[PDB]
Amino acid sequence: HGSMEDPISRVYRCRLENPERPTSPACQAAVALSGTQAFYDWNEVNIPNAAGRHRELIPDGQLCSAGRFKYRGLDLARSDWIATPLPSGASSFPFRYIATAAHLGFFEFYVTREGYQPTVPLKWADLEELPFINVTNPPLVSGSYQITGTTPSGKSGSHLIYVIWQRTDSPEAFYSCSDVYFT
Ligand SMILES: *[C@@H]1O[C@H](CO)[C@@H](O[C@@H]2O[C@H](CO)[C@@H](O[C@@H]3O[C@H](CO)[C@@H](O)[C@H](O)[C@@H]3O)[C@H](O)[C@H]2NC(C)=O)[C@H](O[C@@H]2O[C@@H](C)[C@@H](O)[C@@H](O)[C@@H]2O)[C@H]1NC(C)=O
Ligand SMILES: [Cu+2]
Numbered sequence: 677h678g679s680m681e682d683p684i685s686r687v688y689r690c691r692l693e694n695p696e697r698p699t700s701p702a703c704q705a706a707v708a709l710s711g712t713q714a715f716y717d718w719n720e721v722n723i724p725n726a727a728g729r730h731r732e733l734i735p736d737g738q739l740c741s742a743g744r745f746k747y748r749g750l751d752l753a754r755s756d757w758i759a760t761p762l763p764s765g766a767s768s769f770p771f772r773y774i775a776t777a778a779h780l781g782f783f784e785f786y787v788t789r790e791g792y793q794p795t796v797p798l799k800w801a802d803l804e805e806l807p808f809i810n811v812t813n814p815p816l817v818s819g820s821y822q823i824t825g826t827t828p829s830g831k832s833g834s835h836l837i838y839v840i841w842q843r844t845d846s847p848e849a850f851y852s853c854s855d856v857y858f859t
């Protein structure tokens with residue numbers, strides 16, 4: 677159980693804005709759609725069944741909810757999701773995935789391709805084909821996994837990082853969307 681902490685996922689950020697009275701316009705819209713309980717369950721954007729079959733089980737336009745109607749507020753294609761500034765072509769960004777319960781598993785990091793439009797629902801073809809980080813059981817430190825990688829280098833502006841956490845002792849996987857701004 678968990679989600680991305682840095683850059684922070686939509687689901688965990690909206691939780692931290694308080695589901696009872698959200699502060700950012702995008703989270704207001706998201707909580708209005710999904711209701712509050714989904715956001716208190718920010719750590720469980722999962723498919724208990726995945727077994728690595730992400731593209732098969734998750735329809736286009738439902739990447740951020742992982743095809744789960746419960747998390748449909750995360751699929752909103754808004755221009756005003758709050759984004760984490762991120763350098764393009766750098767190896768020092770402190771990536772963090774907060775785990776309420778650690779698991780045996782690996783994390784695949786994907787970024788959106790050039791010419792991604794935040795105003796269009798996220799489709800599989802909006803992401804790069806290959807992950808820019810794939811890491812098995814990275815160090816767990818103070819409740820968060822610390823992950824190192826090089827960000828792809830010819831990027832600027834509003835993008836998204838999609839993190840898939842596939843367990844190795846279980847078919848269960850977790851799915852995280854993080855809004856970022858390359859700069
Ligand atoms: C990201 O990294 C993980 C490993 O940390 C990749 O998963 C592993 O993929 C290996 C092959 O590329 C799998 O091993 C081969 O598996 C079978 C086992 O029966 C053997 O026949 C064969 O000789 C190899 O041993 C390995 O099983 C798999 N590990 C786990 C726990 O699933 C991962 O690959 C991706 O997801 C897996 C589940 C498969 O769908 C892979 O094809 C797929 O590439 C890496 N992800 C990427 C995108 O590269
Ligand atoms: Cu868990």
Ligand SMILES: [Mg+2]
Pocket residue numbers: 809810811824825
């Ligand atoms: Mg690595």
